[PDB]
Amino acid sequence: VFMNASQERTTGRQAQISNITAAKAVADVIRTCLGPKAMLKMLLDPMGGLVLTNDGHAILREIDVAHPAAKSMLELSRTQDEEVGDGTTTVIILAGEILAQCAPYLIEKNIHPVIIIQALKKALTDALEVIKQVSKPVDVENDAAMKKLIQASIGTKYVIHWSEKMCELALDAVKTVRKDFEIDIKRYVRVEKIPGGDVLDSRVLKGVLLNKDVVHPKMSRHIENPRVVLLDCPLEYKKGESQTNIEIEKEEDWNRILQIEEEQVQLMCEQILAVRPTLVITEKGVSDLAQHYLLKGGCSVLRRVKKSDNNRIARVTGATIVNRVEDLKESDVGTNCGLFKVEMIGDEYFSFLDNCKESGLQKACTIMLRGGSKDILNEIDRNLQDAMAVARNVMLSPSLSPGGGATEMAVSVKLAEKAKQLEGIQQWPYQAVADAMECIPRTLIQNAGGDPIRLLSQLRAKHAQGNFTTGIDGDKGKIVDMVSYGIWEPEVIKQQSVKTAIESACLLLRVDDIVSGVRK
């Protein structure tokens, strides 16, 4: 025989037919996961957990497909999630259609897969132009419009009923992380969960939330003005780096060796008491003896705190990451701490750190979630990532594109009108771009239960005459303009949807053959 190949070489036209059918199959799984009346999806992972959601990205993380063309479609959700954080299902559902509409031609009119690519870049160049023209700017400092902008994505989720609280929850969190350009990052956004409780009393509080309690019982559970000092090192005597081997000759040496173990922990504790802190947060563990004299000054000792939770404390309290204790000064000590208090919950203890609230480093915060169960917490946490992702685009880009499919439908109309004046060989793939852009409103009408035949016919008749902000009401299923409807989305999500969907088609269209089982 010959090399590890040639099992069944899918070559010629049938290879591309399987890819268009495979790419269409990925969109059919989450066809119902779009619009305000979207259905949820419970996926069963093989480890033992469960993922309850409707986001296309979180659905496609858990699924596993043994096909190489569908896996490239699987990776597009990571492009959208780790770029903005909203519209992942929009990316997957649009590309499917682009690959599908271009297929008739590939299969029958024999246009080679390179001429379609040249047609799409001019469509991509024109798509950014009309998306730039259709979008209207909006003021960033208007809190009334910002709340309606944040809740546009929440409306397609379960917590639309609590949208009055989530917009206030997300707006306060984004402004805390926002640095005075206007760059923010979600790594300090703490996703700590508390099972049980009501969503109404759930609120954001400035500062951190630990899972641990104090070590000694005599520690003060209520401090007016805490002074936090971060420690990295072990506060206990440690073995040390080199090969050591003390050799003891006299009887007065072993008690001296055990006595210097007590005096070294005294020396590091006494220099900590030069500034007299109230709360000492150590990264690594703590000894039972050093804690005892940390007590003889008025400090408070905690268990080992992982690094992550200390970098947030450094920005909240204003302290610095300190390992060498001999170089401890008064300037690097945290201050302006609001309040200290420990609540009793049956799961674990929880220590609260509040801030005085009154440029410098960006402040961190922890968002309290009080759901119904464990899956409700993970469901609501992903909604905050989808809701807070919307708040970044308006700050980075003041443009605001219309929602409800009006933006993509505007791309469909202009590409359809300009396709007549684009006479040549590029006309057939260029006109097929509009056929897929008019599907993302078609999916909303199908989920709403209406007839998309007459609605889209009524849409195109009023889109040219009425206005550029016309769209479909997902709840009622009638034509309602986005100006009166009062729901808007950013323009950045529309750019990534058009760019990622077209750029994905240019990769997959160049596939000629599929050969499986070569080597590792």
Binding site: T11, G12, R13, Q14
Partner: protein
Amino acid sequence: MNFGSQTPTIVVLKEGTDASQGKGQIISNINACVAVQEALKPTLGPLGSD
């Protein structure tokens, strides 16, 4: 509505039916005839072999 857990897709041709598209099969058919041709190549002539 469905009868069971899953529903595997139908293969159009019968299971085990060999089929292929493109110019590879007609080259294989020509190479098959050339393989039979090489057996009778040195036989031709009044100075050939049985």
